[PDB]
Amino acid sequence: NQFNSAIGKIQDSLSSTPSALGKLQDVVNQNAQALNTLVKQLSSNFGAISSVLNDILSRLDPPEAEVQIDRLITGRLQSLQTYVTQQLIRAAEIRASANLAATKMSECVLGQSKRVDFCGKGYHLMSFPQSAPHGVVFLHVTYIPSQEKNFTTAPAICHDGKAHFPREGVFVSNGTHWFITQRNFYEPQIITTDNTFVSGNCDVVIGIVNNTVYDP
Amino acid sequence: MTKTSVDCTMYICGDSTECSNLLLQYGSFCTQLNRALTGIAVEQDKNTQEVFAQVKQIYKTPPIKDFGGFNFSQILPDPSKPSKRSPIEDLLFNKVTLKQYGDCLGDIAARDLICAQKFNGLTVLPPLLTDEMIAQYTSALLAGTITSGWTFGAGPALQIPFPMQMAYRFNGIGVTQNVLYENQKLIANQFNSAIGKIQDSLSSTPSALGKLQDVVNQNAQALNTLVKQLSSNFGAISSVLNDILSRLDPPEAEVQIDRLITGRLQSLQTYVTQQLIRAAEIRASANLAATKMSECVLGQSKRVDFCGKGYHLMSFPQSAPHGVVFLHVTYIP
Amino acid sequence: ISSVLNDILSRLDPPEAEVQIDRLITGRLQSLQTYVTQQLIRAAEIRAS
Amino acid sequence: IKNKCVNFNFNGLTGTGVLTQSNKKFLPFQQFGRDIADTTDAVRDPQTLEILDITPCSFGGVSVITPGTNASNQVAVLYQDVNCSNVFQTRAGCLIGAEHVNNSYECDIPIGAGICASYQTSQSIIAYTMSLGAENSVAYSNNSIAIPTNFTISVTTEILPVS
Ligand SMILES: *[C@@H]1O[C@H](CO)[C@@H](O[C@@H]2O[C@H](CO)[C@@H](O)[C@H](O)[C@H]2NC(C)=O)[C@H](O)[C@H]1NC(C)=O
Ligand SMILES: *[C@@H]1O[C@H](CO)[C@@H](O)[C@H](O)[C@H]1NC(C)=O
Ligand SMILES: *[C@@H]1O[C@H](CO)[C@@H](O)[C@H](O)[C@H]1NC(C)=O
Ligand SMILES: *[C@@H]1O[C@H](CO)[C@@H](O)[C@H](O)[C@H]1NC(C)=O
Ligand SMILES: *[C@@H]1O[C@H](CO)[C@@H](O)[C@H](O)[C@H]1NC(C)=O
Ligand SMILES: *[C@@H]1O[C@H](CO)[C@@H](O)[C@H](O)[C@H]1NC(C)=O
Ligand SMILES: *[C@@H]1O[C@H](CO)[C@@H](O)[C@H](O)[C@H]1NC(C)=O
Ligand SMILES: *[C@@H]1O[C@H](CO)[C@@H](O)[C@H](O)[C@H]1NC(C)=O
């Protein structure tokens, strides 16, 4: 039920707020604006008497006109060169982004990742891909703990000399008894010969307490 | 890196009314240049966001500071001074080296470079996040790392004593916790001695922070070269607009002014392209730094040779001018 | 008027040859700058690899 | 005329700028002195022989804070490189047209060294210090552990351009 409610709320939140898919829209706007600027830079006359070839060809003979034509040619070549350079830089940036997307598809979608803050905030559970114009959208499903509680703890336990260390988990106490639990979810359990292992005497561990182990 | 802005009319024409009228034909070019540089500047303030704004709440360090035998009185801020810094942070800040109209008007005998490049339309913008806020972010990160461990990176922070966290980390690297629990004092002494000697080594070497100095030197040299390139006449009779406007009628001065305009425009274009390339490089470096902060500070990483040489234990962040410094703690057989 | 400096220096006096020499200088400087920029971009890609 | 931005013509050299007095020493065969970027900065005087310096009278940086056209037409102005009704002094320069407050909110329009501006209610433009977030302090000890009892499953979206 939590998963279903989460996906429904994600759908509603995407529907409600237009200002969500900023990056792809920015890419499209950048491209369109670049071409529009290239189109409208034709009106400039780079030192020539006019910005129209027809006027120069109509008012001047060839030997007086090649100079104006040459000035215009150099200006327009420079404009095209600038456009190409900007396109190359943007292509490099998009290549880096696509490499990151491919890595994320390889790791978060085809497996489970141990890296922190790579496939979502929290302990990663799984991921799902969705297409979009010129892009991809990853839905990350993760785990988050909450509703914490205080307890009293001690590193080891003295059991007549054989100090006991927890095989896995943490030693906790509610005030009268002692238990060994797992780190994330609270679930206490009684102590037996398992869950523990012995190494050394109870005269070197700083914080070891006196208790008993109900080994069968 | 540094955020800069340029004014075309001041740089090219320089308060000349005969100029800035022939410049209109090229106007649609300059509106591009700034629209590039702005795109750089807004990105810079964004970069610092992915490195230090990982956490959302400012944590406060405890006042008791027992921590078994471990001693952190070189990383945590020292309250008995301004700026709320750390001695290591103080050394890092001091090691890296880096004005109203009346100031530049009175300082003529000594020819300041900053005034010279400000009189030609080149301006430097301040960063959004100040140094004190960066220090506060770092202090919160250290407090969360010390008291909560790796838990505060995913969900609410949970308290845990330091020796238990160290035992968990040894269990992570592949050695049983009983090894730590019975060798606490020697390990703590080794850690303290390592911190002391790393501070001493940082103090001893002057040329240790090469990269940040390289960045600031590159920016300063680029701006100075842009300023000095105004003395070149691109085929005209002179490099001074006033001489041309004083010795020639407008129809003859048109050609020389056009030549100068084209030369200065292409100089500005070259500068902008170089800045864009350097910004891309800095973006890559910042992304790497953000990933390192996410994986070596908020958790223990298993990647080989990623968070230091040897088996990884933990890492500590420190701020620096235009940069970050990671202190990696590693285990070696 | 030509792509060879020798022809220009052989047919014209310095004051008139200066214009063509300037045009050639500007063109070749532009070519060199374009080459350098492309080299920088390729170097960035190689560094990433 | 001195200490005023004027149009000047010295022996045919024309220009626009402010004249001031300096201590440069000129050899008898020198009349002009130019800067590194070939700009005439020092000039003698044909009458009352002396050395004077020329400095341009245009200098500074100006920014315009606006809420947008279809919100209002009120505007604030940020003057860098100056030390000044509503005037506020920041380390990034003087700010005119905005009201300084003591509260702390998020950032709408970045201004400079830790200062942000916003348009809020009658409406007005307010400048303040940006807030880093809430404040928290966990209680460290050597006997207390904190263990969660419940959990939750979260779904988050990440968007990446491809081509
Ligand atoms: C942590 O180490 C510092 C550095 O040695 C200790 O500060 C020293 O304290 C002694 C006695 O108070 C002084 O004589 C030294 O001059 C101090 N050194 C410095 C560099 O200031 C500090 O006491 C240690 N703290 C703990 C809890 O061990
Ligand atoms: C745990 O103890 C601290 C300090 O006594 C207290 O602030 C906190 O609220 C306690 N936790 C719970 C869940 O009550
Ligand atoms: C602690 O847990 C034990 C386990 O059953 C229980 O008997 C005891 O009443 C608990 N004490 C408190 C104070 O909750
Ligand atoms: C925890 O710290 C207090 C403060 O000095 C100390 O008295 C106590 O012995 C410590 N706990 C253990 C298990 O040593
Ligand atoms: C644990 O027991 C030993 C001997 O049985 C005794 O010497 C020691 O004081 C006890 N510790 C505590 C905390 O009661
Ligand atoms: C030049 O003549 C004018 C006459 O009005 C006089 O005021 C000025 O002092 C003279 N200058 C010199 C250098 O003699
Ligand atoms: C804000 O704080 C300053 C300094 O504490 C104080 O003088 C002023 O009255 C406060 N209120 C306003 C509206 O500025
Ligand atoms: C855990 O949370 C769920 C929903 O948030 C709730 O139904 C349930 O009662 C909670 N259980 C505990 C032990 O907090």
Residue numbers in the entry:
A (entry chain C): 921 to 1136
B (entry chain A): 727 to 824, 831 to 1065
C (entry chain B): 969 to 1017
D (entry chain C): 534 to 617, 640 to 676, 685 to 726
What do the authors report?
To obtain structural insight into the S proteins of CX1 and BANAL-20-52, we determined the cryo-EM structures of these two S proteins at resolutions of 2.74 Å and 2.50 Å, respectively. For both S proteins, only a closed conformation was observed, with all three RBDs in the down state. The RMSD of CX1 and BANAL-20-52 protomers from the PT are 1.798 Å and 1.692 Å, respectively. Particularly, the opening angles between N-terminal domain (NTD) and RBD of CX1 and BANAL-20-52 protomers are smaller than that of D614G, indicating that NTD and RBD clamp adjacent RBD more tightly than D614G. The BSA of the RBDs, on the other hand, further demonstrated a more than threefold difference (514.9–570.2 Å2 vs 163.4 Å2), further exhibiting a much more compact S1 packing. The compact packing of S1 subunit suggests the preference of CX1 and BANAL-20-52 S proteins to adopting a closed conformation, consistent with the fact that only a closed conformation is observed in structural determination of the two S proteins. Comparison of CX1 and BANAL-20-52 to PT demonstrated a largely resembling RBD-RBD interaction, with S373 and F374 forming a hydrogen bond (H-bond) network with D405 and R408 of neighboring RBD, respectively. Notably, N370-glycan forms van der Waals (vdw) interactions with Q493 of the adjacent RBD, thus strengthening the RBD-RBD interaction and stabilizing the down state of RBDs. In turn, we introduced T372A to CX1 pseudovirus, which demonstrated a drastic increase in the entry efficiency, consistent with a previous report.
Animal coronaviruses (CoVs) CX1 (formerly named BtSY2) and BANAL-20-52 are phylogenetically closely related to severe acute respiratory syndrome coronavirus 2 (SARS-CoV-2), and CX1 is the first observed animal betaCoV carrying naturally occurring Y501 in its receptor-binding domain (RBD) of the spike (S) protein, a residue related to human adaptation and broader host range. The S protein sequences of both CX1 and BANAL-20-52 are closely related to SARS-CoV-2 PT S protein and share high AA identity (97.96% and 98.43%, respectively). Additionally, both S proteins lack the PRRA insertion on site 681, resulting in the absence of furin-cleavage site (FCS) facilitating S1 subunit dissociation. Determination and analysis of cryo-EM structures of their S proteins and RBD/hACE2 complexes revealed that Y501 shows a synergetic effect with R498 and inter-replaceability with H498 for hACE2 binding.
